[PDB]
Amino acid sequence: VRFLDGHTPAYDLTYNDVFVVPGRSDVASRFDVDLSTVDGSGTTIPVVVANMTAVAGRRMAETVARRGGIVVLPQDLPITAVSETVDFVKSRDLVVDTPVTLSPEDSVSDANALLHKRAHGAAVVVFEGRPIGLVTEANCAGVDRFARVRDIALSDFVTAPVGTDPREVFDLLEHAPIDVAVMTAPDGTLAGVLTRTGAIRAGIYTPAVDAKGRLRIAAAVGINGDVGAKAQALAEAGADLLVIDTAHGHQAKMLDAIKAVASLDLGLPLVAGNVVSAEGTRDLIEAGASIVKVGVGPGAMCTTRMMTGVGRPQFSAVVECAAAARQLGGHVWADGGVRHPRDVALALAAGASNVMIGSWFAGTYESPGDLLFDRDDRPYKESYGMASKRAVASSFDRARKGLFEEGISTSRMSLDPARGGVEDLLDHITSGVRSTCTYVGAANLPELHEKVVLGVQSAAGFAEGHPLP
Amino acid sequence: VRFLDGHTPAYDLTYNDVFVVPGRSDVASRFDVDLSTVDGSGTTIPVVVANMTAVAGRRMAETVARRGGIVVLPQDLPITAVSETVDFVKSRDLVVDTPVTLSPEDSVSDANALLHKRAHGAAVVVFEGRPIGLVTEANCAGVDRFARVRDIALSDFVTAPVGTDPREVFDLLEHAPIDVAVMTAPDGTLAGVLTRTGAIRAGIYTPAVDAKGRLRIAAAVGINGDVGAKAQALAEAGADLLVIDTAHGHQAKMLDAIKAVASLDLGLPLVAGNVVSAEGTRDLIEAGASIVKVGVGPGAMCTTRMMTGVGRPQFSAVVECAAAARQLGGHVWADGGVRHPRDVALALAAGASNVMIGSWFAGTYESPGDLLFDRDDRPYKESYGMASKRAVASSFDRARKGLFEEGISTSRMSLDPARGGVEDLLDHITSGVRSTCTYVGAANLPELHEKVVLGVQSAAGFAEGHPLP
Amino acid sequence: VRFLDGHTPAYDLTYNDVFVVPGRSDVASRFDVDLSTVDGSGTTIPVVVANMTAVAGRRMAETVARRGGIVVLPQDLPITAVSETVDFVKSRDLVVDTPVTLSPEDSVSDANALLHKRAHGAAVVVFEGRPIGLVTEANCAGVDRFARVRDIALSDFVTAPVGTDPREVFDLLEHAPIDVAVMTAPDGTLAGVLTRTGAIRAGIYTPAVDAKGRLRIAAAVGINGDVGAKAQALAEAGADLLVIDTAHGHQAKMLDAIKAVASLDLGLPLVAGNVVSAEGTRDLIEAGASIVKVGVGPGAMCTTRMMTGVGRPQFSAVVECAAAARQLGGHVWADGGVRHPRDVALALAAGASNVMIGSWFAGTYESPGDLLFDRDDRPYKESYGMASKRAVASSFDRARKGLFEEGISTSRMSLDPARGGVEDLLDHITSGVRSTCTYVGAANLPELHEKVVLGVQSAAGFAEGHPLP
Amino acid sequence: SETVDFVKSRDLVVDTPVTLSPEDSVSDANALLHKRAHGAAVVVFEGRPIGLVTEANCAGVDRFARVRDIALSDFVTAPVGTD
Numbered sequence A, B, C: 001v002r003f004l005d006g007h008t009p010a011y012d013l014t015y016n017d018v019f020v021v022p023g024r025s026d027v028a029s030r031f032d033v034d035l036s037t038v039d040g041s042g043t044t045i046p047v048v049v050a051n052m053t054a055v056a057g058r059r060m061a062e063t064v065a066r067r068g069g070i071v072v073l074p075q076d077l078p079i080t081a082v083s084e085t086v087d088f089v090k091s092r093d094l095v096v097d098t099p100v101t102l103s104p105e106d107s108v109s110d111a112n113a114l115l116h117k118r119a120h121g122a123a124v125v126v127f128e129g130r131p132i133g134l135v136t137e138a139n140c141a142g143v144d145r146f147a148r149v150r151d152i153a154l155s156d157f158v159t160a161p162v163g164t165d166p167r168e169v170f171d172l173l174e175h176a177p178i179d180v181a182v183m184t185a186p187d188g189t190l191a192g193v194l195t196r197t198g199a200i201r202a203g204i205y206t207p208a209v210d211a212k213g214r215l216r217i218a219a220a221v222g223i224n225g226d227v228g229a230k231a232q233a234l235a236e237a238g239a240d241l242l243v244i245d246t247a248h249g250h251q252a253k254m255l256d257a258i259k260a261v262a263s264l265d266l267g268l269p270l271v272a273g274n275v276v277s278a279e280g281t282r283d284l285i286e287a288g289a290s291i292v293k294v295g296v297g298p299g300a301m302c303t304t305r306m307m308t309g310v311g312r313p314q315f316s317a318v319v320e321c322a323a324a325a326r327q328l329g330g331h332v333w334a335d336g337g338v339r340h341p342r343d344v345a346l347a348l349a350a351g352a353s354n355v356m357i358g359s360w361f362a363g364t365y366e367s368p369g370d371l372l373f374d375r376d377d378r379p380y381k382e383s384y385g386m387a388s389k390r391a392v393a394s395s396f397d398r399a400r401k402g403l404f405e406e407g408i409s410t411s412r413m414s415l416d417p418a419r420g421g422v423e424d425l426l427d428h429i430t431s432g433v434r435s436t437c438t439y440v441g442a443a444n445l446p447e448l449h450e451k452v453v454l455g456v457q458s459a460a461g462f463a464e465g466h467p468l469p
Numbered sequence D: 001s002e003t004v005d006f007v008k009s010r011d012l013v014v015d016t017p018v019t020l021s022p023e024d025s026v027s028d029a030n031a032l033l034h035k036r037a038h039g040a041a042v043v044v045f046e047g048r049p050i051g052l053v054t055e056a057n058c059a060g061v062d063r064f065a066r067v068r069d070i071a072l073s074d075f076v077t078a079p080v081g082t083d
């Protein structure tokens, strides 16, 4: 990267300590920018969902993969559940979203609770595979909680066949009381649901698909036990990319696991981490890792800096690791510390190929965590860190080992009323990155890295501009 | 120490301005790290309790010495009380803790007040030296405050003979309603109490013992009056280490006291302070001090920076003093400014041999201060600084001298519900230090000092990570 | 001054950005330090009261001059009032304080209001010049507000003749219910009052006196109108030192006023300001000013930095001005920005001869402002800045000139319950300065300036230590 | 029976005060101070009064100190049968 003359601070830099200087540009609009990555992950947008049980899930994986991103399944998850999740993700449609399905014998409370599992805002009642009505929050209000779905006054729905152009579906929903359109197969069974916003997004985001035209998905493995057997089993399960995640990636165990995984010649890309030094990236790449995971400390649930003082500011670590990888022909991923699209844009300008977002996506409908309401009826969801699952591994021995184990951190993630779904956050981040590219004057991410000019600002410089949310 | 290239700030550094960069490591787990010090203090862990009347006490000394630390008794304490404290500490068992003892004729209010003197959560009723029952907070609830202990419905207790392996004691407490196990001598009298957590800790922490196999203890002396006579008297009392503490250690008086103490050839290690300069450490070591106490200003109750502007950031002072001492073959101690295990880890990486913790331990059950409850029933204890006791020394003359004397600072230290006892804080700090060593890649503290790489971060860098407590 | 190696910041420094590094010392106690100034002002302590109508007054001048300081009367004050103030100050006793006097015909409300005019806490009822009783806050409580003083149950008082050694007076007040001792002349009339604290202070502070043995006092003049005539008139009135104060001291008008005043050969020391540059000090000294006033912006009521952005951090300006003055054989005064004794100690170490304290002393009993009570009955007093009086000078013309005039700033200054009087603040500041001198190892202020070593700290370094009040 | 004996063993004029021992705890003394309306307790050693304990004395003292540590205040003494 290029810095302004005289901008050589005597300390490492974070996302808040840097800014992007505009340059001469010829990009007319945001839509002229290509956001496809070149790291081999197959993602058309530089967004990756972290491998956390509070974030990664079936609905989240499907929604992110449909819009071009990828989701890494949490490590140590049972192999059967991984198989079902992969099959469900790869069995989805590339355009039509999967709605919440209900039976006429279901309870009203179950319908109300399931209404928030998706951002569509409505659920499709299915009888013998055929839609028969719609359930919305207005219908369940005032009704006995233990009545049946068939008692609920099911509302009419706009129906269109599958394969219809999204423009027509958008047109039919212009005056529809409910902004959902059910897509029915030529047989007549339920194929999915579509919305005006979804129809608009269909023409903007290109889904990330494998060689067979199915949505991509990734799985994570630990370094304890037989790493090679687990990696081979997950590769056979249909995973498109493998991640070997650990708290400290610059250790012997990590390198041995990398070598064991690479010896199998599975053919899938390998992601390893985490390191915050050039030597660590050189060691991981030489061991056989194609992509290096970068970041130790900036995790929103990571307490390493408070427990140990060990860590590094994200920006300097990312730039150093990216330079080291590019030197050896590799790629790096920015992990942790993302709160705003500014962080993603700066990480991309730093030299990273992808930006792994973690606890930010936990405050969405698609997150596996159950929706909760605060004292002021404000919706929120609880998120937590992976704790010991990222660490290196008789009741007495169990208690002795768990005495020194780090506690599970927790925090509340509020849901934005206008950005309840993860697709809204994806739109936010993509708009920010596209605006950054237009300001720099780059048509693609490699040009963004090549042409960017960075600067250093003080504490007062960050507060400049509109008050942060 | 080694810093990153270009990290040469134009100001002194604190604990919040530095971070540890991970390196290549081969340490599998935390338990492979040896935390024994090499400064001659005999502590198996780098934790020292400050010589304050609000922190140092019999129970605190016993608990800290059992887990490997040492406690320095406050200066100017009466010699008889010092003798009783030393005898009580050296008469304890290396494995079995000392519980709260009660008589059947004792009041219920006295039992309730004494229940919080230890972290066991229960007290053993003793009649003719034989346990007869147990008193818990549930038993005293609802009972008249002025009834007798014999009126309280004493609960059954799990009994095991002394010398039993801690694994068996842990096994017998698996389903016990009260998580305490009383140890009885072959005669049948009370020898102590043991808990599941204590049984687990017994196999992790090696107690710090003298040549006779008894728990170690230290005492502090001032520089006023006859320093040599007091030092000799305390050495004869059984103290294992002598500390000469004063507010400003780089003065003539201090050096003369050091020379007088060293002329006696007591054979005990000598600790002197406090200085924050290399010249001060050179002067103290040449005077005969084996260990130099470092720190002027970062004390939680020290107002020198506000009254006088005199002081120095702890990290730079510690690194300079450690370099100067090692040059002359000495050792330094970090005193004050510790709030989190990050501070201890950074001080150890700076080059210090031990880290003296002060007011942090005051918010524990073992502290001599009486337990108090806030308006919201939150437990807390008051702590205060040593004031004039650290300064260089007719009602009229007394008032004239006390007119310019510094006031006694005070603050409230809340008790963590999950870390009420000092053993929990010791576990916290030891886990942090072990994780730091594993991240650096060091099997012992000298290797931690040799292999550590430091960095400099701005204000925004410190806020990175999980919100501080 | 001397800074630590590598401590060369790229910005100007304030009081909060610097610290004093301890050195080798041989000063046994605080009382061995001599605080006498060498700038010719005659003050035995480095404390000067600012020329503000909210701070400078008869009682404040007397109290400060008795303890060794000096008070500068506000400019543009009527000459008759200046004459009465000077006569009253020079007619006071060097040991015995002046108490509040009341008549038996006075109202109870007047007595209550006057009780807070002094820190003695009691008033002496005088009939025909002879004390007859004492009035305290307890006596007036519960009594009708419009009763007479003679109705109040006057309490007995300890009486001692003038010239008695303060030790005896302190002894007689050991068991006195009221801690005031009235001093009676050999005739038998009231000469003053004395307290235990006052008796103690009498042996510590040496009063600042002129050649005739009377308390010193100073007066301030502006630069508008005939400066020479006003200066000569104030010199004839008995002022011991002249100050020419203006907002911007580096201007032609200022220099012409200095020349006009110096041409009169009054023989009194001249103080001029304010400038924050070496060139300004050189210009003022060459014009005839013996002492240069330093500081533009750090005033607690100064809005120049917010209205104009013009100013300079106090520490760098003070060190530069002190170096420039000493080069030409002059002296400088630190003005504004004092909140704690740390500021005074740092200003003295910077090279200043005296430290002028302003709005800090406004929150005292001796300040001319009327005592006020907050909503929570907390005592406080209002303070305000000099505004246009420091600026360079038909209803229409008056309004046109006042349209651009700066507004009068105001703020609330709370009274410390333990430091209600200004003597307590003087004790605080003197103790801080003496402790600073002992830490540095200096027996006097010139040695403090010569031997001091300074350092630079970041924002986190300032927060180190006990929480600031 | 004990209550009746205690009631019938009292004096018709002089009230029964709260009695304390020098080895008693400060918390016990504070709690017992409110058992009577006298507002003070009489410290008794070998049947002889030696001092007085009031709420002001116990304030600021460690709760688990002894009664003998408390600064016992002087008391006005008069023989029984005095008018």
Ligand SMILES: Nc1nc2c(ncn2[C@@H]2O[C@H](COP(=O)(O)O)[C@@H](O)[C@H]2O)c(=O)[nH]1
Pocket: A057, A058, A059, A099, A100, A101, A102, A114, A117, A368
């Ligand atoms: N009936 C019904 N249950 C659902 C639906 N989505 C999720 N669930 C229930 O909720 C559980 C958890 O949902 P998940 O976290 O897998 O999306 C599922 O295993 C299933 O029992 C839906 O659309 N309809």
Ligand SMILES: Nc1nc2c(ncn2[C@@H]2O[C@H](COP(=O)(O)O)[C@@H](O)[C@H]2O)c(=O)[nH]1
Pocket: A050, A051, A052, A247, A295, A298, A299, A300, A301, A302, A303, A304, A335, A336, A337, A338, A356, A357, A358, A359, A360, A384, A385, A386, A387, A388, A390, A409
């Ligand atoms: N040390 C640690 N790191 C965690 C934990 N949970 C998540 N992380 C890290 O933090 C990243 C997410 O950070 P976020 O984007 O939420 O700020 C994850 O991808 C992972 O690298 C945890 O419990 N401990």
Ligand SMILES: Nc1nc2c(ncn2[C@@H]2O[C@H](COP(=O)(O)O)[C@@H](O)[C@H]2O)c(=O)[nH]1
Pocket: B057, B058, B059, B099, B100, B101, B102, B114, B117, B368, D064
């Ligand atoms: N009966 C009884 N008193 C105790 C016990 N521990 C402390 N005390 C009382 O509390 C006082 C202060 O306790 P310390 O601060 O020495 O632990 C002791 O001198 C003693 O009077 C205990 O286990 N039993």
Ligand SMILES: Nc1nc2c(ncn2[C@@H]2O[C@H](COP(=O)(O)O)[C@@H](O)[C@H]2O)c(=O)[nH]1
Pocket: B050, B051, B052, B247, B295, B298, B299, B300, B301, B302, B303, B304, B335, B336, B337, B338, B356, B357, B358, B359, B360, B384, B385, B386, B387, B388, B390, B409
């Ligand atoms: N100047 C001063 N230092 C104190 C006082 N009390 C404790 N200290 C210092 O502060 C250290 C403890 O700091 P802490 O660990 O509580 O932040 C002590 O070991 C001692 O060096 C006091 O009253 N005055």
Ligand SMILES: Nc1nc2c(ncn2[C@@H]2O[C@H](COP(=O)(O)O)[C@@H](O)[C@H]2O)c(=O)[nH]1
Pocket: C057, C058, C059, C099, C100, C101, C102, C114, C117, C368
């Ligand atoms: N009777 C009486 N009035 C006083 C005393 N001190 C001040 N005053 C009144 O209060 C006014 C203002 O007080 P000053 O601000 O000059 O101290 C005086 O002019 C006088 O009227 C005092 O001791 N006795």
Ligand SMILES: Nc1nc2c(ncn2[C@@H]2O[C@H](COP(=O)(O)O)[C@@H](O)[C@H]2O)c(=O)[nH]1
Pocket: C050, C051, C052, C247, C295, C298, C299, C300, C301, C302, C303, C304, C335, C336, C337, C338, C356, C357, C358, C359, C360, C384, C385, C386, C387, C388, C390, C409
């Ligand atoms: N510009 C300006 N300076 C003032 C005013 N009042 C006081 N000052 C300056 O501020 C100094 C006092 O500052 P302080 O010690 O209250 O922080 C005075 O001695 C004078 O130099 C005002 O109204 N305007």
Ligand SMILES: Nc1nc2c(ncn2[C@@H]2O[C@H](COP(=O)(O)O)[C@@H](O)[C@H]2O)c(=O)[nH]1
Pocket: B146, D017, D018, D019, D020, D032, D035
């Ligand atoms: N030491 C002492 N204990 C008392 C005194 N009065 C009451 N107690 C205690 O408090 C209990 C209850 O008091 P009661 O309700 O009988 O007045 C008694 O049985 C006794 O243990 C007293 O004056 N001194």
